[PDB]
Design an enzyme around this catalytic site. Sequence first.
Site, PDB file in Angstrom:
ATOM      1  N   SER A 124      50.651  47.221  34.695  1.00 24.15           N
ATOM      2  CA  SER A 124      49.863  46.266  33.910  1.00 24.15           C
ATOM      3  C   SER A 124      48.355  46.292  34.165  1.00 24.15           C
ATOM      4  O   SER A 124      47.596  45.617  33.435  1.00 24.15           O
ATOM      5  CB  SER A 124      50.343  44.835  34.070  1.00 24.15           C
ATOM      6  OG  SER A 124      51.610  44.702  33.470  1.00 24.15           O
ATOM      7  N   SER A 136      50.531  38.823  31.606  1.00 27.63           N
ATOM      8  CA  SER A 136      50.932  40.235  31.466  1.00 27.63           C
ATOM      9  C   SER A 136      52.123  40.400  30.504  1.00 27.63           C
ATOM     10  O   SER A 136      53.156  40.938  30.901  1.00 27.63           O
ATOM     11  CB  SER A 136      51.260  40.879  32.833  1.00 27.63           C
ATOM     12  OG  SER A 136      50.080  41.036  33.621  1.00 27.63           O
ATOM     13  N   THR A 161      46.468  42.011  38.246  1.00 28.29           N
ATOM     14  CA  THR A 161      47.625  42.576  38.964  1.00 28.29           C
ATOM     15  C   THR A 161      48.393  43.652  38.194  1.00 28.29           C
ATOM     16  O   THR A 161      48.308  43.756  36.964  1.00 28.29           O
ATOM     17  CB  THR A 161      48.668  41.474  39.370  1.00 28.29           C
ATOM     18  OG1 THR A 161      49.077  40.728  38.213  1.00 28.29           O
ATOM     19  CG2 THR A 161      48.088  40.487  40.380  1.00 28.29           C
ATOM     20  N   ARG A 217      50.148  41.835  47.217  1.00 29.20           N
ATOM     21  CA  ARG A 217      49.070  42.438  46.364  1.00 29.20           C
ATOM     22  C   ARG A 217      47.773  41.625  46.449  1.00 29.20           C
ATOM     23  O   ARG A 217      46.680  42.177  46.330  1.00 29.20           O
ATOM     24  CB  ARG A 217      49.506  42.482  44.901  1.00 29.20           C
ATOM     25  CG  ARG A 217      50.686  43.416  44.613  1.00 29.20           C
ATOM     26  CD  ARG A 217      51.212  43.267  43.186  1.00 29.20           C
ATOM     27  NE  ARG A 217      51.430  41.872  42.747  1.00 29.20           N
ATOM     28  CZ  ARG A 217      51.797  41.537  41.498  1.00 29.20           C
ATOM     29  NH1 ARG A 217      51.994  42.483  40.558  1.00 29.20           N
ATOM     30  NH2 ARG A 217      51.975  40.264  41.180  1.00 29.20           N
TER      31      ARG A 217
END
Lengths: 242, 241
Positions: B46, B94, B185, B226
């Site tokens: 993404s 996303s 992300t 992340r």
Amino acid sequence: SITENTSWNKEFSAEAVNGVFVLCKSSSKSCATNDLARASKEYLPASTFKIPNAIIGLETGVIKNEHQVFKWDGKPRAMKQWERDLTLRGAIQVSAVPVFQQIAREVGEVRMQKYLKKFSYGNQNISGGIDKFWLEGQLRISAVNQVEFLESLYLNKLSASKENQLIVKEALVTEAAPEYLVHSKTGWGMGVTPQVGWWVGWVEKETEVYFFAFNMDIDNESKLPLRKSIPTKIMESEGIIG
Amino acid sequence: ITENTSWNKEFSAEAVNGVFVLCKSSSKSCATNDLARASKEYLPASTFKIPNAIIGLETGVIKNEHQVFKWDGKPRAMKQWERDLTLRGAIQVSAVPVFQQIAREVGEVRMQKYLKKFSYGNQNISGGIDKFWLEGQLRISAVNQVEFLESLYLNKLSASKENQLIVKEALVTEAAPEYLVHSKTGWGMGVTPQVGWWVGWVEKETEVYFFAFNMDIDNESKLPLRKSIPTKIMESEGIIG
């Protein structure tokens, strides 16, 4: 266009606030306010004037682009927070008066006058000195007029490039959440009596947008946070923020 | 680009393999925990929504910044994707199907042309016009992500300034008066081992820091790293406090 909601005075009463909120879904064609009379009354804009001033600074080339750094020369300033180098966004968000006084002097009276006519900005009165008319001079704008101006900016409909409108819009982001995004600007007109406090802007949540303008009389500095908390409480009860 | 091996403690604390690349001012002064991984190319997942959005706007597939992407009615991999979305809303949650339809209308030839202009990774869009960044042959390194984001920040990509500004506003994730974060992300399920990403930039007073993080993801439970690993690294560097 505009409906009165006197229940909202509940939010004003605990703290004994004299003030007005104007809130519109989608466009200035469907607004509500707690007080029709005060909604249309014009008050000194104070630092809310940084919005048109920044757009006019960009349109005239006085401000180079969104990455321009405004250096502090080392001369003391009215606020500790202003005594550093600042980006355009930083200057707008810490409401750095002397940066914008210099922008206004470089724009000049003739061009300033023209741009406020293009933007239909309040009484368009810039007398009192080119570097102080929005702080202690004769300029006055209503909450309804603030919403109309911000709606035009949101839609890129002001007489200015889309680029410069977008740049100023990014500079106005104040809250980013996963469901919603807030653009906004405070003002505190100290050089007028009673002193006026402002919070104006818009909220995007899901696929909708709401434009708002709040102002109130401020005697004492301890009341400043009410200029955000009163309208936030109203917006949160409707689901607009949260 | 220099190596700071002490940054490795943040990865071993969490039992994970990965890389952090951080640059102060520009991509000319960068540091990483792992010089080799910094340059290895991975499926962008993404994180591809950034160039895809810009390309959507440039080609006119995305009309303007207030475009609403209507949900048809047919079910979707996530129920959180089952609603009308703005560009920012689709980017923020996303919503893969939104971006698949953009990629389709963009088409192969235009997508290829823009990824060349953007110098985007290995520029290999094989595997299907609507899946190449999720399960196909597209690969990009953390170093190249930072170069690409630096160009976006400077309005230097081959796209209008106005479209670069629109996409930047869609990426804003944290805001305070003199601190602003743009970030995105990713989670690349369609390749093995699975890749997790976090990429972006931080404007703090008058400085800017560009960053790109990736790691091997075993399953969903490790996805929060992340953000937490880069955050700790940036904290030890004095950026956050």
